Structure 1
Amino acid sequence: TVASFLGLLVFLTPIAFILLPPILWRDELEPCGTICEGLFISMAFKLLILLIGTWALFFRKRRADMPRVFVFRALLLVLIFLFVVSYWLFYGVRILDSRDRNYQGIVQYAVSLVDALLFIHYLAIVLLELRQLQPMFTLQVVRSTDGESRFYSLGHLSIQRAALVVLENYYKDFTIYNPNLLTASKFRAAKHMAGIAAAARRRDSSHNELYYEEAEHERRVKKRKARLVVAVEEAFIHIQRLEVMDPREAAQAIFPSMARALQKYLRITRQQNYHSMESILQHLAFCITNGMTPKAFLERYLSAGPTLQYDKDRWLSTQWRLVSDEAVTNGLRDGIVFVLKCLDFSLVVNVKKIPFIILSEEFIDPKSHKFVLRLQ
Structure 2
Amino acid sequence: RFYNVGHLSIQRVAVWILEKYYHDFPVYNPALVIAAAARRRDNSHNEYYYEEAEHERRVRKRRARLVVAVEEAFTHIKRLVMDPREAAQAIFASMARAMQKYLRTTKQQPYHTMESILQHLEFCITHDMTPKAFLERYLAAGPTIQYHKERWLAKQWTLVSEEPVTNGLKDGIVFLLKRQDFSLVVSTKKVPFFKLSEEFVDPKSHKFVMRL
Higher relative contact order at CA 8 Å, sep ≥6: structure 1 or structure 2? 2
Give the match for residue 221 of structure 1.
59
Distance in 1 of aligned mates of 2:160 and 2:43:
42
CA displacement, residues 195-220 of structure 1 (integer Å, 9 cap, x when unaligned): x1111111111001000000000000
Computing the radius of gyration over CA atoms, which structure comes out larger, 1 or 2?
A: 1
Deviation at 1:172, TM superposition (A): 1.3
Counterpart secondary structure, 2:188 = strand
Give the match for residue 123 of structure 2.
286
Give the match for residue 162 of structure 2.
325
Give the match for residue 12 of structure 2.
161
Deviation at 1:166, TM superposition (A): 0.3
User: Does 2:69 align with 1:231?
Assistant: yes
How big is the alpha-carbon RMSD for the aligned residues of Structure 1 and Structure 2?
Answer: 0.7
TM-score (norm 1): 0.56
* Number of residue-to-residue matches in the alignment: 211
Q: 1:205 aligns with which of 43, 50, 65?
A: 43
Letter in 2 for 1:283: H
TM-score (norm 2): 0.98
The 5 A counterparts of 1:81-100 are: none
Letter in 1 for 2:64: A
Deviation at 1:367, TM superposition (A): 3.6
Letter in 2 for 1:204: D
Letter in 1 for 2:13: A
Letter in 2 for 1:241: R
Give the match for residue 353 of structure 1.
190
Distance in 2 of aligned mates of 1:288 and 1:366:
53
Q: 2:102 aligns with which of 265, 289, 293?
A: 265
Letter in 1 for 2:129: M
Counterpart secondary structure, 1:151 = coil
Distance in 1 of aligned mates of 2:128 and 2:12:
40
The 5 A counterparts of 1:62-101 are: none
Letter in 1 for 2:144: T
Distance in 2 of aligned mates of 1:372 and 1:231:
57
Give the match for residue 309 of structure 1.
146
Deviation at 1:154, TM superposition (A): 0.5
User: Does 2:89 align with 1:252?
Assistant: yes
User: Does 2:27 align with 1:176?
Assistant: yes
Give the match for residue 79 of structure 2.
241
Deviation at 1:314, TM superposition (A): 1.2
Give the match for residue 366 of structure 1.
203
Distance in 2 of aligned mates of 1:239 and 1:320:
45
Deviation at 1:362, TM superposition (A): 1.2
Deviation at 1:368, TM superposition (A): 2.7
Deviation at 1:372, TM superposition (A): 1.1
Letter in 1 for 2:177: L
Counterpart secondary structure, 2:185 = strand
Distance in 2 of aligned mates of 1:342 and 1:174:
15
- Between Structure 1 and Structure 2, the one with more helix by share is 1
Deviation at 1:316, TM superposition (A): 0.5
Deviation at 1:364, TM superposition (A): 1.4
Distance in 1 of aligned mates of 2:175 and 2:55:
36
Letter in 2 for 1:317: A
Deviation at 1:315, TM superposition (A): 0.7
> What fraction of aligned residue pairs are identical, expressed as a percent?
77
Deviation at 1:326, TM superposition (A): 1.1
Distance in 2 of aligned mates of 1:170 and 1:320:
12
Letter in 1 for 2:26: T
Give the match for residue 39 of structure 1.
none
| Structure 2 gaps, min length 5 | none
Deviation at 1:249, TM superposition (A): 0.3
Distance in 1 of aligned mates of 2:6 and 2:98:
47
Deviation at 1:300, TM superposition (A): 0.3
Counterpart secondary structure, 1:171 = helix
Distance in 2 of aligned mates of 1:360 and 1:335:
29
| Structure 1 gaps, min length 5 | 1-149, 182-195
Counterpart secondary structure, 1:348 = strand
